[PDB]
Write a protein that binds this ligand. Structure first.
Ligand SMILES: *[C@@H]1O[C@H](CO)[C@@H](O)[C@H](O)[C@H]1NC(C)=O
Ligand SMILES: *[C@@H]1O[C@H](CO)[C@@H](O)[C@H](O)[C@H]1NC(C)=O
Ligand SMILES: *[C@@H]1O[C@H](CO)[C@@H](O)[C@H](O)[C@H]1NC(C)=O
Lengths: 144, 306, 17
């Protein structure tokens, strides 16, 4: 069973407010499976730095904030982060909880960015090779 | 891998070929691969793209086979397409029936004369002289890219070291390109006597044709599985001196040109030969690329040695 | 400088006297 939307203007509050949606009943072709990445898929922020463009990186993935491990965050990913946060260019990456330890969950996923991506949500992610990261190695970024 | 039982590992999935990462690639994973192909036991698990870089997806990574799985995709893995590797990390295998042949010589830089040894089950061993024909030696020389024919030399009685032998009674028909298709005795690890070791010499890659003596004639060289000639462009007395030396003829007396002894045949393998006259082999002289000649057989080079 | 194909899995280490 498939839902077809003929078109909404985009200012609607709900998908149900989009007009003329079709629920089931038409013989879908071979171009199935549309998939969205929203801006809240992964949201960076900098916490605990002296300036907003400096701090520990925390990313909300889903509804949970998590730290990124210093092993899992490249220069290209920091460039993407600094652009997305509109913080300019990456000035430095700092390991060893230089800005203090995070709290709670640390994401065990590596960002394989090319460095031109507008958002980390578009960056490929790889599973962490076997290893417990601790908050003593949470990565920090300073942008320009 | 030069045979059905060695090489880079490729998997067919969803209609496309893809590779496996060498991360955690161990002998148990290779053993699962080797068993799935019916290739027996794994002898060596090669990483680091030993067989060259692949193309396409890397399908599997962090392989953790228990070694009892009948198929590589039954092993525990991170799952299809979940990988952090690149094709520089493609895994490969070598199993125990991967067989290779060589001639080993202690006394000559001559790659085509020596004791006949085969690699099997992880080790080199001698071939038994029993029932070996000159046809079989010809097969060996072709398979090694040495020549069409060769001779079995008598073994040197002066060697006291016993070598492992793998096979004897090797009989090839006319036709086969590799010794493996030739019926023989079963694999048996025995100590060879020095007299049973097969030493062969393939004939020389160089011959003189149609000259009045065995040390005069048109220069022919064996390459690519055929005889071919040498162009007389730059052909000089130092080239003829080199030619004379590989045949064990004495000093070059004359370098002849313009196919004085008749035109040769097949490819003109070498053009613009520029030896210094002190090379061990005509193959060691600077020349144009092998088999690229603008010359005709009218320009076939000839020599007259002492 | 800074152009590498490696991952951190390939980080070099040493042990000297
Ligand atoms: C794997 O292959 C290389 C190829 O030269 C060989 O030398 C080596 O011994 C092999 N590994 C083992 C454990 O024998
Ligand atoms: C060199 O060639 C001549 C005639 O071309 C031949 O008679 C002679 O035997 C060769 N030289 C020697 C010293 O034998
Ligand atoms: C080399 O490293 C080992 C552990 O990898 C360590 O125990 C050892 O002390 C180092 N070598 C020496 C000679 O001390």
């Amino acid at each position: 069973t498939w839902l077809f939307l003929s078109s909404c203007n985009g200012n609607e509050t709900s998908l149900w407010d989009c007009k003329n949606w079709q629920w089931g009943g038409l013989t879908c072709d071979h171009y199935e499976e549309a998939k969205i990445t929203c801006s809240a898929h992964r949201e960076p922020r900098l916490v605990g730095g002296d300036i907003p463009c400096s701090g520990r990186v925390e990313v909300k993935h889903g509804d949970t904030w998590g730290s990124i491990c210093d092993s899992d965050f490249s220069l290209e990913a920091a460039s993407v982060l600094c652009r997305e946060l509109q913080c300019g260019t990456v000035v430095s990456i700092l390991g060893g909880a230089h800005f203090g330890e995070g709290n709670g969950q640390i994401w065990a996923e590596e960002f394989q960015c090319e460095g031109h991506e507008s958002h980390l949500s578009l960056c490929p992610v790889a599973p962490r090779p076997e290893g417990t990261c601790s908050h003593s190695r949470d990565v920090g970024v300073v942008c320009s | 891998g030069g045979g059905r039982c060695a090489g880079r590992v490729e998997i067919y999935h969803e209609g496309s070929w893809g590779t496996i990462c060498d991360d955690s690639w161990d002998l148990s994973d290779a053993h699962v691969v080797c068993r799935q192909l019916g290739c027996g036991e794994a002898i060596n698990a090669t990483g680091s793209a030993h067989f060259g870089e692949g193309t396409g997806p890397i399908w599997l990574d962090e392989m953790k086979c228990n070694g009892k799985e009948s198929r590589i995709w039954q092993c525990h893995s991170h799952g299809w397409g979940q990988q952090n590797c690149r094709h520089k990390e493609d895994a490969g295998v070598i199993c125990s029936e991967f067989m290779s042949l060589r001639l080993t010589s202690e006394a000559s830089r001559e790659a085509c004369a020596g004791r006949l040894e085969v690699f099997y089950n992880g080790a080199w061993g001698t071939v038994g002289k029993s029932s070996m024909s000159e046809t079989t030696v010809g097969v060996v020389c072709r398979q090694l890219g040495c020549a069409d024919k060769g001779k079995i030399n008598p073994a040197s009685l002066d060697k006291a070291m016993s070598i492992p032998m793998w096979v004897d009674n090797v009989q090839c028909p006319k036709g086969p390109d590799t010794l493996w298709q030739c019926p023989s005795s079963p694999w048996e690890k025995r100590l060879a006597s020095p007299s049973e070791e097969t030493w062969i010499t393939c004939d020389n890659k160089i011959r003189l044709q149609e000259g009045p003596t065995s040390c005069s004639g048109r220069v022919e060289i064996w390459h690519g599985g055929s005889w071919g000639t040498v162009c007389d462009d730059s052909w000089d007395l130092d080239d003829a001196q080199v030619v004379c030396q590989q045949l064990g003829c004495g000093p070059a007396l004359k370098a002849f040109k313009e196919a004085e002894f008749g035109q040769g045949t097949g490819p003109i393998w070498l053009n613009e030969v520029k030896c210094k006259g002190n090379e061990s082999s005509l193959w060691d002289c600077p020349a144009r690329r092998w088999g690229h000649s603008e010359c005709g057989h009218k320009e076939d080079a000839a020599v007259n040695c002492t």
